[PDB]
Symmetry: C4
Amino acid sequence: DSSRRQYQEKYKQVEQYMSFHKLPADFRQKIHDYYEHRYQGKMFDEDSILGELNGPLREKIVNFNCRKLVASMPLFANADPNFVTAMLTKLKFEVFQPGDYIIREGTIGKKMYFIQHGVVSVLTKGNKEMKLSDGSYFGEICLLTRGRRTASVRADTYCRLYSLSVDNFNEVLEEYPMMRRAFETVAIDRLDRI
Amino acid sequence: DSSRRQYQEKYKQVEQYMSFHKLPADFRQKIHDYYEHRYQGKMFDEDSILGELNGPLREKIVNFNCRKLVASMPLFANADPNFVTAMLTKLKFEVFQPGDYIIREGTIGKKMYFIQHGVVSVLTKNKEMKLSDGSYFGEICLLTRGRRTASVRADTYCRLYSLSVDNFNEVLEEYPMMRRAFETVAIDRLDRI
Amino acid sequence: DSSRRQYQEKYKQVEQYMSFHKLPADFRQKIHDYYEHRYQGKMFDEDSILGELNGPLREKIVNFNCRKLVASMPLFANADPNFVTAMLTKLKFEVFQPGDYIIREGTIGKKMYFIQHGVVSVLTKGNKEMKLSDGSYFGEICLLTRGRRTASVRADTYCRLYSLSVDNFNEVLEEYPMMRRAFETVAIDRLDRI
Amino acid sequence: DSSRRQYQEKYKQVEQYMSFHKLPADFRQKIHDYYEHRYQGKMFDEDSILGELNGPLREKIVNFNCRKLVASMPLFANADPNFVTAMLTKLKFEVFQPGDYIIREGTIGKKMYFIQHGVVSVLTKGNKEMKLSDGSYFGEICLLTRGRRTASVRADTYCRLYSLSVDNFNEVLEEYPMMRRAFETVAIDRLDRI
Ligand SMILES: Nc1ncnc2c1ncn2[C@@H]1O[C@@H]2COP(=O)(O)O[C@H]2[C@H]1O
Ligand SMILES: Nc1ncnc2c1ncn2[C@@H]1O[C@@H]2COP(=O)(O)O[C@H]2[C@H]1O
Ligand SMILES: Nc1ncnc2c1ncn2[C@@H]1O[C@@H]2COP(=O)(O)O[C@H]2[C@H]1O
Ligand SMILES: Nc1ncnc2c1ncn2[C@@H]1O[C@@H]2COP(=O)(O)O[C@H]2[C@H]1O
């Protein structure tokens, strides 16, 4: 079908791009593996498809695609369904590979991440490593402080995450301001542990 | 024709997307029906076509496509034709299915809707009322910048034109006295609530 | 040629669009003639092509294409060539058909127009009609005043124009502020005539 | 071969555009030569490809493509690798042809350039010409002063450059403020020589 063909064609152009730029074989394989994990052999113009729909259908789709994620977290599971929809609509799906630095300590943080599937290591230089997995989130501290990252976060396994930018976080909280407290609780607890 | 082929091909992609995401059969039927009602078996890159034209032709097209909507509302039918063209230019066509919540009470409202064809049910949580062809709703929050005073749910398929609060205010920069039309309606409805 | 095929395929889409929306025959004829005059049987992804180039080549192309326009106006012919290039780069080519309102009196004006080829009729309601043609410009008054249009301007012949937005006008004049005087002289003259 | 076909098809479109606009044969050849030097017979939708990846992979790619440029400049070679990545991510690759004015004296400057390969001539009207080549940069003075260009800079040879806008320059320096000093040192030295 057309979506399988689109993946095969797009991947051929990626191979050619990597060849043109003389990328090493190991990195070429890393890109191969990334495409397999991220797109699973099919590609869609999701923006175009979703843009063809209406609000209700888009909201039904995002809620469906994120059912498990939502179930995982009391943040979403116990909230106003209109809040959950608002936040889910803003999320960006991202895949990271083992060893990737998702967050680097000391940098200016502008995104947080919700873990759909995978394990990450949180490492504050000089402190003990802590791990987070399915149904946890991280990177909230900088969304609240507008400061610098308090720890590095690396992918231990392949990680299927949803990211949320500070502007989108704040935009949603304009409508649901009391939900900020959920994130502050976590941030405070983590800052105490650090 | 290329436009029918575009629909058929675009719809196949949508089927594959729904398959990939494992969406339930009933939802897939709902999406299929949406595409049939919204696009009627043809698809166009409207933005590209309109972008190829000039101002006069774009304005002629939007006026023609909306001529019935315009005749159906004193707002537009009795107004400066240049105001009508300015407002029509900002409208976005949207189709909603029976049961859809177009507006949810209590949310921050940033759009209003003009009913070209269809019936909606308006409810403040009491006693429902209905609006149909030639009515508009959602104006209150465009004026107040507050929260929705009622939920509005499609009873039939609804062919609507939406207008964002920013586009509303932009047009009213040039035609400020037209704001009164919307305020009259909002005041009347707030009194009824 | 690919550009000729593009025109033919694009125009078939337009025909189908017009059919779908049930536009009257006379309107369809009008659209057909517009495509012929504006595109002359060929179409290019001009944005894409120019985006593939560099500054110097883009500037050479716009200067070449506007050679006659520039020669026709002391504004451009006598000016710093860097000013001319800056202004030309901002211009948008537009074609209008006989009878078209280019500007409507009393509306908020945000663009001016340079006449490459054609004749327009300038009319302030209640006043005498006058004509402008190749090498004239109009619509400058509102760029300077930020007020309402002082006259309507309608295409008499087919008009090949270049438009310039108020923001682009002001942007160029940030760098070449003394060039504002040229437009003011013309505006002052016309206001006195009105 | 999809990328080679893309170049061949894209260039046919360019030839036809030039024919439509009646460009002289010498200019057409100049455009042909530019496409050969800039794209080298292959074209990619780089924005699309990079947009399909994640942060870590994009950063790996930009670091790889620029590693020699980085090696050549103490600015980058001795810096926090996170600063280098942040700056590299903002760079735009540009190719200029012999004789091109990259910078014109007295104009409002909004970009600087890093030389990957080529020779440029710097000339302040009335002063002695100076040359710069691989591993030098120029155009920094206006990014710091927000004033007018202190010299013209012309391509002596074909020049393969990376440009950086003033807004991107300042954005990166929000995170790495002390790195502004490197550019000020160079600017000061050059202003002294002028
Ligand atoms: N002790 C901890 N346990 C779990 N997560 C942590 C801990 N310390 C820091 N983090 C997370 O690591 C993230 C690094 O980026 P932020 O500082 O924005 O937000 C931080 C927290 O979400
Ligand atoms: N009694 C009523 N009759 C008709 N429409 C109403 C009534 N009450 C509320 N509405 C509409 O329902 C809309 C809900 O969104 P708004 O509050 O923005 O604007 C409201 C009105 O347009
Ligand atoms: N007597 C006149 N002669 C030439 N041009 C005119 C005259 N009166 C008005 N105009 C032009 O018509 C334009 C209408 O839009 P503006 O008022 O922005 O700017 C106006 C002038 O450029
Ligand atoms: N003597 C010099 N040696 C090297 N580069 C110079 C000299 N004088 C000016 N420049 C460069 O020429 C550039 C022209 O644009 P800027 O003034 O923005 O920044 C200037 C410097 O980067």
